[PDB]
Every structure is written in structure tokens, then in C-alpha cells.
Write a protein that holds these residues in place. Sequence first.
Motif, short mmCIF file in Angstrom:
data_model
loop_
_atom_site.label_atom_id
_atom_site.label_comp_id
_atom_site.label_asym_id
_atom_site.label_seq_id
_atom_site.Cartn_x
_atom_site.Cartn_y
_atom_site.Cartn_z
N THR A 1 9.36 -1.72 2.83
CA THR A 1 8.78 -3.05 2.78
C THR A 1 9.78 -4.13 3.17
O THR A 1 9.39 -5.29 3.35
CB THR A 1 8.22 -3.30 1.37
OG1 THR A 1 7.34 -2.22 1.01
CG2 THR A 1 7.46 -4.62 1.28
N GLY B 1 -2.75 4.40 -6.00
CA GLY B 1 -2.47 4.05 -4.63
C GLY B 1 -1.13 3.41 -4.39
O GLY B 1 -0.86 2.97 -3.26
N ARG C 1 -0.39 4.16 -0.20
CA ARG C 1 -1.11 5.10 0.64
C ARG C 1 -0.70 4.97 2.10
O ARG C 1 -0.42 5.98 2.76
CB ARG C 1 -2.61 4.88 0.48
CG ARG C 1 -3.17 5.51 -0.77
CD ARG C 1 -4.67 5.39 -0.79
NE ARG C 1 -5.13 4.24 -1.56
CZ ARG C 1 -5.55 4.29 -2.82
NH1 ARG C 1 -5.55 5.46 -3.46
NH2 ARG C 1 -5.97 3.21 -3.46
N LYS C 2 -0.61 3.74 2.62
CA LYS C 2 -0.20 3.56 4.01
C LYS C 2 1.25 3.98 4.23
O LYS C 2 1.57 4.61 5.24
CB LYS C 2 -0.41 2.12 4.46
CG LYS C 2 -1.59 1.90 5.40
CD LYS C 2 -2.93 1.88 4.67
CE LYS C 2 -4.10 1.69 5.65
NZ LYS C 2 -3.85 0.58 6.62
N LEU C 3 2.15 3.65 3.29
CA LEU C 3 3.54 4.07 3.46
C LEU C 3 3.67 5.59 3.43
O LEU C 3 4.46 6.17 4.18
CB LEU C 3 4.43 3.41 2.40
CG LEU C 3 4.73 1.92 2.60
CD1 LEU C 3 5.64 1.40 1.50
CD2 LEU C 3 5.35 1.66 3.97
N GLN D 1 1.39 7.83 4.23
CA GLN D 1 0.86 8.31 5.49
C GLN D 1 1.95 8.33 6.57
O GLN D 1 2.13 9.33 7.26
CB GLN D 1 -0.32 7.42 5.87
CG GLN D 1 -1.05 7.72 7.15
CD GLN D 1 -2.03 6.60 7.43
OE1 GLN D 1 -3.11 6.54 6.83
NE2 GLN D 1 -1.63 5.66 8.28
N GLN D 2 2.72 7.25 6.68
CA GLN D 2 3.82 7.23 7.64
C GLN D 2 4.85 8.31 7.33
O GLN D 2 5.28 9.05 8.22
CB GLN D 2 4.51 5.86 7.65
CG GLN D 2 3.65 4.70 8.06
CD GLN D 2 4.44 3.41 8.09
OE1 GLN D 2 5.63 3.39 7.77
NE2 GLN D 2 3.78 2.32 8.48
N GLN E 1 3.53 11.67 8.22
CA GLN E 1 3.51 11.90 9.66
C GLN E 1 4.91 12.22 10.18
O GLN E 1 5.08 13.10 11.02
CB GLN E 1 2.90 10.70 10.39
CG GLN E 1 2.85 10.86 11.90
CD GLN E 1 2.41 12.27 12.34
OE1 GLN E 1 3.14 12.95 13.07
NE2 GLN E 1 1.23 12.70 11.88
N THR F 1 2.98 -3.45 -6.41
CA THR F 1 2.29 -2.22 -6.06
C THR F 1 1.08 -2.02 -6.96
O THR F 1 1.13 -2.35 -8.15
CB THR F 1 3.19 -0.99 -6.18
OG1 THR F 1 3.66 -0.86 -7.53
CG2 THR F 1 4.36 -1.07 -5.22
N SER G 1 0.85 -1.18 0.00
CA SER G 1 0.00 0.00 0.00
C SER G 1 0.89 1.24 0.00
O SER G 1 1.54 1.54 1.01
CB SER G 1 -0.94 0.00 1.21
OG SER G 1 -1.68 1.20 1.22
#
Lengths: 290, 289
Positions: A152, A268, A8-10, A12-13, A16, A264, A6
Motif C-alpha cells: 500500500t 477480506g 483480497r486484491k493484494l 490476488q497479486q 499470481q 483493513t 483490499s
Amino acid sequence: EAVVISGRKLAQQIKQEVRQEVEEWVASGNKRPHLSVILVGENPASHSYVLNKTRAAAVVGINSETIMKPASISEEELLNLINKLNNDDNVDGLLVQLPLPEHIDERRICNAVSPDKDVDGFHVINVGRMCLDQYSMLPATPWGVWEIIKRTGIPTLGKNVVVAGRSKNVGMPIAMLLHTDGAHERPGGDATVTISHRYTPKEQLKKHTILADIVISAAGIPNLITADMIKEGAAVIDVGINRVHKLVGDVDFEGVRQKAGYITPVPGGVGPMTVAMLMKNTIIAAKKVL
Amino acid sequence: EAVVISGRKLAQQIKQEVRQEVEEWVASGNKRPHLSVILVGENPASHSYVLNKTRAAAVVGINSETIMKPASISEEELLNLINKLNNDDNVDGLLVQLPLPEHIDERRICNAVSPDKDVDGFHVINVGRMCLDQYSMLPATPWGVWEIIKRTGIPTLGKNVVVAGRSKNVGMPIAMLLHTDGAHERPGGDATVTISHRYTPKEQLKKHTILADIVISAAGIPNLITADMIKEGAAVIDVGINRVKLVGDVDFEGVRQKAGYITPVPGGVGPMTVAMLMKNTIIAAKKVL
Ligand SMILES: NC(=O)c1ccc[n+]([C@@H]2O[C@H](COP(=O)([O-])OP(=O)(O)OC[C@H]3O[C@@H](n4cnc5c(N)ncnc54)[C@H](O)[C@@H]3O)[C@@H](O)[C@H]2O)c1
Ligand SMILES: NC(=O)c1ccc[n+]([C@@H]2O[C@H](COP(=O)([O-])OP(=O)(O)OC[C@H]3O[C@@H](n4cnc5c(N)ncnc54)[C@H](O)[C@@H]3O)[C@@H](O)[C@H]2O)c1
Ligand SMILES: Nc1nc(N)c(NC(=O)Nc2ccc(C(=O)N[C@@H](CCc3nnn[nH]3)C(=O)O)cc2Cl)c(=O)[nH]1
Ligand SMILES: Nc1nc(N)c(NC(=O)Nc2ccc(C(=O)N[C@@H](CCc3nnn[nH]3)C(=O)O)cc2Cl)c(=O)[nH]1
């Protein structure tokens, strides 16, 4: 069946992490970072991508403005805008979204951005420094590809990597980052990298991908990568964004999903990572560490 | 059996071409070109190679000087000499022979040479321009490798090429030239290029070279390339110079039996490096770029 990474999730990290870095920076009394994006013309993909960039900037505490100009702008007019922004001390990062209209030389534009504000890493000094494995502002899409692989946990040292595409802003920097020395100023992946491109015959591409632990496709061709070309268990990173009939990458996603160990998705996948790595570069530019 | 490509003979032809260009430049009323070479320390290989460069300068009618300094020179002292030569209008070409001592940063030294006089092509602006396929001063050894291929008529477009070595001054420029677009400002070779290096396992290197139409070894390891690793009729270009007697990276006698083309060591890429430097020096003297 393949782990679907993902992006998107990576991202986001990563975002942040940047919000934290920016807030500690501002908390210590420094100016809040500011990113300026110049957008020329009405490319619907360009506007979409630029909005994604400025939305991500707001979320991580980076101020921004998008300066939109008509496609009829002349090269001298764009150069004037770049020079005014170069001399605006409030502007930490400056980038000109590509592609530009045919009558404007993109290389002249990219070199007009002050190298210290060149969050794209497109200025010739930044390109040269990157190709020498020196500390540099890394281009966002190649850096995002790098981060996808590293975060990953997919190893690169001594592994076979095929890159499909040799463009100066995407394909070439990816090959540069993956094959170069882990011990240099800017570390590389220490992979064995094959560069393929529009004159690589299809059969020769397959003869190299079947050996590849990691296949990275940045060609803009639907279904260029199919399961018969992929080593079982390989990681497949799809950089292309192609309009078919719907958006797809260069990879036959459903087929390759069955043989790869990692893949991938598009959208996204790499896309959100591009935006996130630009946020990394913008705080780097504001700190003036280069 | 493999055609053995004489780098010595090709280089000597190229030097004659430069001599003619220099003589007509002077006969047109322009100052004779001058190359300055800075040599630091006592590396015997460096001293030999610089001598070959100053010999070739005399051959093609370019004035030259070698300025030798002890290894204990400081970086600031080397920078001062470079700034002196940057501001000497008689100096058209200026290069600092590598490697330099550990206390001197080669990249800072290479970037201090005025770009117009950078006959090595090592200045970051030249590196960046080369990596973007723009007009640039090409580094001598990679350009010599390219010339060996081009002047011999070995095709590259759509072909498989393996480079063993990724050094910034040799292996990386060779891979850049061979894989890039023939239609750009500075044309490339349009080959499919595999970059291998010290972390490529010997088994994986062989699995790529065996597909290769051109194998270019710039690793500095005797017998890195052997006949079993090469496909029938391939072109093998040996950039390594290893003291073992001087040999290349290639098992010359074994690969000689399976390759279609091969370069010897010595007398192969080495002389071509010197000839392409002479080409760069007259280009620098004309303020072409
Ligand atoms: N964030 C992201 O996900 C992201 C970011 C940037 C670009 N992209 C996408 O990457 C793709 C390419 O963009 P670009 O600007 O690098 O394009 P480009 O047209 O400049 O380059 C495409 C490359 O593909 C190569 N190629 C063509 N045919 C090939 C073949 N059969 N086999 C192998 N290589 C072949 C070409 O030689 C060229 O180097 C597009 O889909 C673009 O949108 C995605
Ligand atoms: N004109 C010429 O003939 C000429 C010019 C320059 C250099 N050279 C020669 O080229 C050789 C290397 O030069 P350099 O400046 O690149 O040296 P270097 O030591 O900086 O680079 C050596 C390179 O070889 C790679 N390598 C090491 N072991 C390997 C292996 N098993 N498989 C694949 N790659 C491996 C390393 O990763 C590195 O990229 C030396 O013999 C040098 O004298 C010749
Ligand atoms: N100067 C300059 N110029 C440039 N052109 C670039 N490159 C660039 O910006 N690339 C880029 C950036 C973000 C996205 C993205 O947000 N992707 C999402 C959404 C896909 C989608 N589209 N429509 N609907 N969904 C996804 O892939 O998931 C995609 C791309 Cl290609 C640059 O970096 N610098
Ligand atoms: N700034 C800077 N620094 C650098 N280091 C380089 N690289 C460089 O000079 N390379 C280089 C140049 C010439 C030779 C040569 O003449 N080879 C002959 C003779 C062999 C021999 N030598 N001793 N005994 N026999 C042969 O190969 O036949 C060999 C090499 Cl490696 C540069 O280009 N610019």
C-alpha cells in the motif's frame, strides 16, 4: 474518509506472482511443489482456513493434501505422522493447523516439523533466526501484515507503530518485523514499535495509539480500537477475527473509517493475505534456498 | 532526588550466592566448574570486560582461562578451537567475546558453541527458546537489567517501558523479557514496551519516554536521555558505556533530579552483566536445561 485496503486484491497479486514463479520452476524441469496440511479435530474455523489454503495452492500450481485426524488422536500418533511426512521426499511444505487439542503440546508438535518443510516458521530454529533478522521462513500472518503495509506504500521507517497483542505466532513476529533494521539479512520496517497486551491498561493503550502512524490490532477483542484512539490519517491494520451479533475485527470499522487514512476490513483484509503468504513460503521451501 | 542503584553492590551479592552454590556443588562430589573465554584481537574494552569476567570467576570458585587470539585468525581456525573446547569435558562454559573481526561471522561462531555450554545464551536455539518464553540460557546483560529491576522491587506489570536500542544481544532480549507473560515457563515482566532505535526521531523518543515508568537505554550515545524526557519518579537504567572518562547514555546528574531510580556508569549494569554470567556458568555446569 479512509482508503479501505483490499486484502483480497493484494492477495490476488501475490498469488499470481507465485503461480508465475511455480510455473517457471516446473517449466525448468523441477518437481511440482507439494504442501501437506495436517488438520486435527473439528474446529469449524480451522477447516474453513485450511480449505482456503488448499484452494489457493491448487490455483497457483502447488499440489496439496489435507490429512484430517480426529481430536482424540494422541501426541505420539501425531508425531508419527509428522515423521513419515518429514521423510516423504515428495512433501516440500508441512504444517499442522492450530489450535490443537489440550492434551497435545503445540510447541513439541511445531518443533517436530522438519525446519526445511516448516512453511509456518513455527520451528524454534525458524523463530530464533527470525528474531535475529536472518533469512528465515516468515510466519504467514505477520508476513501478510508486512506486505499489506509495504504494498500500500505506507512508510514505516521512523514511524510510530502500536501492536495490540503479543502472541508468539502473530503479535510478536509483527512487532519484530516492523521495528528491525532495513539493512539486515531479512529487512525490517525500522519503526518505533510499542507492544501492548492483556495487562496494558486501556488508558495507556490510548496514550500510545494516539501517537501511532500505524495501529495493528491482533488481540481478538471487538471494538478494542475506536476513533478516539487513532491519529487522524493513521493506518489501521485489523488482524482479529471475532464472532459478534457476524464477523468483525478488533477495530470499530465504521467509526475508525472516518478518522484513519487507511483501514483493513474484516473479512477480506489480513485473512486472504495469510493464505497468500503461505503460498510464497511453499515455493520457497520447494526451491530449498534456505 | 533519585535512589542511585549500585550495580556493583548487587552484583557482589549475587556472586556470593553463586560462590555458595558452586561450593556445595563441589562438596557434593561434582567437578569444579570451568569457564573458557575466547578473546580475538585487541579491543581494549573487550580485554577489560573479559578480565572482569575471569576475576569474578575466581571470586565464585569457578576455574577459568582466557584464550587470546590475533584478529587475523580465520573463521575456520576459530571454529576449530571452539570444536576442541566443545569436546573437552572439563569445559562447562564457553563464550566468544564480541565483537569479532569483519571476516568472522558472529552468528556462525555463536551457533558453533555447543548449546549446553552456551553461557552467553547466543545460540539460535537459546534465542528461539527465549523468544517463545521457554526455559533458556538468558543472555547476561539483559538478565542483569531484569535483576536490577526485580531485586530493587520496581514493578513492571501494566507499566510503560521504553528501550532505546534493538541490538540482538542487548536491546531485543531486554524488550522481550520485559513485555512477555509472567505466567509462561520463563516469566516476563508484563510491561507495555516501546522499542526505539537509530531511526526513531529524537522528538518521538521523548514523546514515549515521557510516558514511561522505566527507561532502559542501550544505544551508546552520551546524553541520549535527559531530565526533560523522563517523567517524575521513573526508573532509569543506563546500559551504555561511552568513552567521552566513562559515561552512560543518560545525563546522570540531570536525570538524578527527576528520576526515582537511576543506575550509574560505570558501576551499574556492567557489574551485573558479569554476575549473571557466573549464574549461567553454574547452571551450565549442572546441565540444568
Ligand atoms: N489471517 C488473519 O487475519 C489472522 C491470522 C491469525 C490470527 N488472527 C486473529 O488474531 C486474533 C488473536 O489471535 P492469537 O492466536 O494471536 O490470540 P492469543 O489469544 O494467543 O493472543 C491474543 C493477544 O491479545 C492480547 N490482548 C488481550 N487483551 C488485550 C488488550 N486489552 N489490549 C491489548 N492486547 C490484548 C493478549 O495478551 C494476547 O497476546 C484472533 O482474532 C485470531 O483469529 C487473524
Ligand atoms: N553490561 C553493560 O553495561 C553493557 C553490556 C552490553 C553493551 N553495553 C553497551 O550498550 C551500548 C550499546 O550496546 P549494543 O551491543 O546494543 O550496541 P550496538 O551498536 O549493536 O547497538 C546500538 C543500538 O542503539 C540504537 N540506537 C542508535 N542511536 C539511537 C538513538 N538515537 N535512539 C535510540 N536508539 C538508538 C541502534 O539502532 C542499535 O539498536 C554500548 O555503550 C555498549 O558498550 C553495555
Ligand atoms: N499452523 C497454523 N495454524 C494456524 N491457525 C494458522 N493461522 C491461520 O491459518 N489464520 C487464518 C488463515 C486464513 C484466514 C482466512 O481465510 N480469513 C478470511 C476468511 C474469514 C472467514 N471465516 N469464516 N468466514 N469468513 C478473511 O479474514 O477474510 C483466517 C485466519 Cl485467522 C497458521 O497460519 N498456521
Ligand atoms: N560473548 C559476549 N560478548 C560480549 N561483548 C558480551 N558483553 C559484555 O561483555 N559486556 C560487558 C561486560 C562487563 C562490563 C564491565 O565490566 N563494566 C564495568 C567496568 C567498566 C570499564 N571497562 N573498562 N574500563 N571501565 C562497569 O560498567 O562499571 C561491561 C560490558 Cl559492556 C557478552 O556478554 N558476551
